[PDB]
């Protein structure tokens, strides 16, 4: 399973633009090992979405909606790593169906191994395969979380003044509703996808009350 | 750096007894990969004690007291793994001083690699080396956290009714004060160590108001 190369390139452009919001000269400041560590830590969030602990709340239920968020986060970081290292310098590492918690725990631990080896392109392929298997719209999730990531930067995430959970709702949870109106074809159609990505962005901006003047539309992010 | 084999054996006995509190037949129920995953997840807690994120609260300070707690947690799990697999089936993986955050991030990521390879004895050696380098009393930390772990089980940790942070204080934080009166010699002295471990246990029981009747003294845990 792979995305169209034109879709992958647009996602990469979005990723570069977001990384530039975080730091103008990120391509000089960041190193491959940074992206390895970030993927590791998202992979721990992903594992922690399951009731893996045999000593703590053993009848807990998995947070399968959060799984989608953490896979999307891994994609942001694997796209970023791939901009710095091609893998030169799947069925062995990923186990389907991921609906089986044993398969998920094994697979997602193997993502950490791939990350440590700086096989970022393979991590991207793993995430695409995982979304295909689970049946969620990875591209739409990406555009939505990309927008939230930018919003967080606007609202002081980098200086420690942001609050992610408010009135019982984590910011990430509001993304599901922003994405549900969009089909896979909507966000991958060769001629029209950019308009649909723009629509996702504005839904996320609405969800967080971003004043119109502070919003960045799809064209901000693309080099095509 | 290593502990006396008699001290290591007593720690292993304590570990077996705690694992038995969690499940009577843990030696049949648990598998090596469980301990790999647990060490991985504690290693993520440990990494997250540092200001590693370049996009979120970049001027945050490391939680160096929590570092001691997470290393102690790793030891519990590496002792446990070693009861199931000897490594048959350091300066390369650990970088000193760990006071240097770059050294810490690299070292603690390498603990995840060692855990995935099920080199539990090597993980134990890493933790002992880390405490020696940082200069904290690993054995005293172990006995204190071992006691809290048992307390958590008494107070519904396994069924999801426990609350770890109360009135602004996480349970782990109360351990530091329980341990500070004890020297390295106190808790490793060949003839007298068991009394000092018992004393640590009772200090932790006091910290949590454990009724005298529910307390388990040092003799509960030892087979010597
Ligand atoms: O240079 C960076 C740093 C962070 N992120 C994004 C990707 C993930 O979706 C998100 C995770 O944020 P945390 O919740 O882990 O803070 O951060 C980037 O895209 N680029
Ligand atoms: O079979 C088990 C399960 C857990 N722990 C202990 C070791 C760590 O100190 C502690 C970590 O607990 P959490 O905070 O991760 O729940 O659990 C054990 O000793 N044995
Ligand atoms: Mg994260
Ligand atoms: Mg995440
Ligand atoms: Mg833990
Ligand atoms: Mg811990
Ligand atoms: Na998360
Ligand atoms: Na912790």
Automatic annotation (TrEMBL), chains A, B:
CDD domains: NTP-PPase_dUTPase. Ca(2+) binds at residues 42, 45, 70, 73. GO terms for cellular component: cytosol; nucleoplasm. Keywords: Calcium, Hydrolase, Metal-binding. Mg(2+) binds at residues 42, 45, 70, 73. It is an enzyme of class 3 (hydrolase). It comes from Trypanosoma brucei brucei (strain 927/4 GUTat10.1). Its EC number is 3.6.1.23. DUMP binds at residues 15, 19, 53-55, 73, 149, 152, 157, 164. This is Deoxyuridine triphosphatase, putative. Gene3D superfamilies: Type II deoxyuridine triphosphatase. GO terms for molecular function: dUTP diphosphatase activity; metal ion binding.
